[model samples]
Target: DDTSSSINFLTRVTGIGPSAARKLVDEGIKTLEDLRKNEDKLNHHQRIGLKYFEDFEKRIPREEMLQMQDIVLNEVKKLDPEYIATVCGSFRRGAESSGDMDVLLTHPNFTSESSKQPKLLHRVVEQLQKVRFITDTLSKGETKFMGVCQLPSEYPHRRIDIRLQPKDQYYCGVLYFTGSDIFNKNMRAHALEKGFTINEYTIRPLGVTGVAGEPLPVDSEQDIFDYIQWRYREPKDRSE
Candidate 1:
């Protein structure tokens, strides 16, 4: 049991896989404390993993997620009433608990080709920062923001991702983000089998020559499923 537990624990430590876990166990690094002593051997991600190991491992209850979603949506709405935002990932799938949060943010004015840096995305992040909700930014780009956030000062810092999509591509983006990775992969494989190519951006028909045709009009997530001829599944039903 100790051997199996050690292997499982090591696998959860970011960069260490089963093989490495076994090796570590053989090397007498059987606990987090043991691994911490050998910190020099870890990569950047592994170091961050070790730093926030307990925090990252903690799951957010559904009620806490709802509180976070409300804060974010309310703040974004204050910036622009029409801004569309949805908490995706496991939260959208109605999981009782989530490891972190993923949100898709879009406005009608923010198209993929419109701006290298969208003002609304930045403004919302700024407002949240002013409120002390977002404590640190891990990364930010034209259409994506990754950061750490907490509801209250006493709460643990949690990973948060905000993605800005064009209104036309919004639903497809939502569908992609509101996934268990395995489910997304399976859906993409199904789309390929049906002569279509689907990505987070758009879904296009596959041509006879294996090229992708122009993206089809997808007004909703169901439209993408329709293009692939798969039965429609709500986000909660898509946790496969």
Candidate 2:
């Protein structure tokens, strides 16, 4: 079982193929640590295999992510678009590169429903998939879809996701998702100190019992941040 397990693990390493993985196992290498121990024993191609981690560990470039965004949004525009969409990622937080993409979607007509609204998400994803943009699907639900996509040339498969949400929720989702992680934690902590409760979905007031009261008006990011009684940082300013 260890032999087969090592073989499978080796195959996932960047430069190691099925045949190469088997050959390493045949020579009694049992793990990556084992391979490193026998490094001088590696053949010509085997030495190059070391480049897997050395050459391939960088994050996706900003230009590549924008290219994916251009195509995905253009595809969604073909449908009757009452949409407000934004990419929620390190890019929105003004990073040099990113790990994946988060596209937040909302329409005035698309809201939380008593019966649940599946067809709204179905329509947009169907349009994107039909154009060969969505290369592989990971999961899909009434509010969210996760998938891998490639731009028309031989590009790296980039991770992309979408969330169909109510218009009010979209603003909160956009504010929270356009985060540099720590800024959000700081924002939430600020809220409790300010006598309100804030989250990705809603902002509420606290009572004498320190309980969250009714959800309040949230038409924009300004509404959430101002209501929380803090100066709302722009997405670029959110790099905390």
Candidate 3:
């Protein structure tokens, strides 16, 4: 969302000018709420684009997404032999290509007694910087890294994001990364319809008071689906 290219592309798709887009950004209108709450504020072109905007929110270009996934996977592989990862975006869902990759990294022994993937991520990034594969990091934090990487082959460089989450957040990561964006959004919308709030980090029980449980630590994607009470859909079925 912070990327100017993203903002510019979104503007083109929605037929909005830079000024209006900047206004929307200033008004804290990053999500769908902006369109819902300030429908009147949008120019005629933007209002007419509502439908495509909705659709755009759901589908990501497949190829670029996969490139980023591979970059992250290779980086992680270099850091720890025991670490394993799943690419879980349009790329995982049998798309011929993708816009950007979403990957979740985990180790088999990811228990409280022995979990070091987070540290591994830090080291990996440091080494990547040294090699210039990751030429510039857009954002860097404890749990997430966003940047651009130059592919080794003749292909163009692409944007990449990597998250080194806590082992307990593994399932949550899978649910998010393994998305058909439409599926993810519809699921969240339905959860909200049931008076629950779902987010990348946690799904909370809302409206009813006396909530007492901590977030359940989930080690696998299957556990996440079980918690949400949805039939486990294979990555390929995500579009449906």
Candidate 4:
């Protein structure tokens, strides 16, 4: 059961099928490069598979991730300019060539405990479809969306996820998601040294009985960095 992010991205197509996907993998096809290189070497049941694979995430350039971010950002802001759509993950880490897109989208009305519209999150995807950015949905629900989105012509589909978070945890959530793995390891390590528990959801002190302290209020990245007792690093310097 060997699997990986880009390793299984081929499975996202509508009818590539398990056997067909395995064949692509066996042919050493791992990215859009492999798909194009192996175009004659493999057989997909449908051309959409080929069309989709033409711009597979693993094979696309890093700068292209920025283009998709704008497409989603504009459409989402059109829904409500007050809403926040922050790009994180590799893009945040300044990858020279990016793969997929990850965003932390939040609104004042959609917090952790607040009960509001059931389809609050769905509206974003439905809105994305209106702009034709969302080509297909791999998974869907409020607070999280996994799907394929393409850049405008000349570029095609690639994987994307837009995560939900409480507006209250905006900074913490963005900081955590902006991570370069080792950066978080170091960040969290510093957090605990201060007798605090820091996670994507909240930052609270660890009490004498090992109980969780009430979440501290942090309205910005600097707040968390200050409370966590570290000099705040810019997103570009975040990579370990």
Model number with the top lDDT: 1
**lDDT tens readout by residue for model 2, 27-80:** 998677877777676653454344333323346788988887887677677676
Residues 15-36, candidate 1, lDDT per residue (tens digit)?
Answer: 5778878988888887899889
Off by over 4 Å in 2: 1-58
In model 4, the worst 10-residue window by lDDT is 41-50
**How much RMSD separates candidate 2 from the native structure?**
8.5
Give the C-alpha miss distance for residue 231 in model 1, angstroms.
3.2
Where model 3 places Cα greater than 4 Å from the true spot, the runs are: 1-71, 106-119, 130-132, 189-197, 203-212
lDDT of 3 at 51: 34
Prediction 1 global C-alpha lDDT? 0.85
lDDT of 2: 0.75
C-alpha RMSD in Å of predicted model 3 compared with the true structure: 10.5
TM-score: the better of candidates 1 and 2 = 1
Superior candidate under TM-score, 2 versus 3: 2
- lDDT by residue (86-128, candidate 3, tens digit) is 6666678788855544556666545434535465566766766
Clashing residue pairs, candidate 4? Answer: 62-97, 62-98
- Reference-based TM-score of each model: 0.77, 0.75, 0.59, 0.77
Residue 184, model 2: Cα distance from true site in angstroms? 0.5
Would you give me the overall lDDT of model 3?
Answer: 0.62
* CA shift of 168, model 4, Å: 1.2
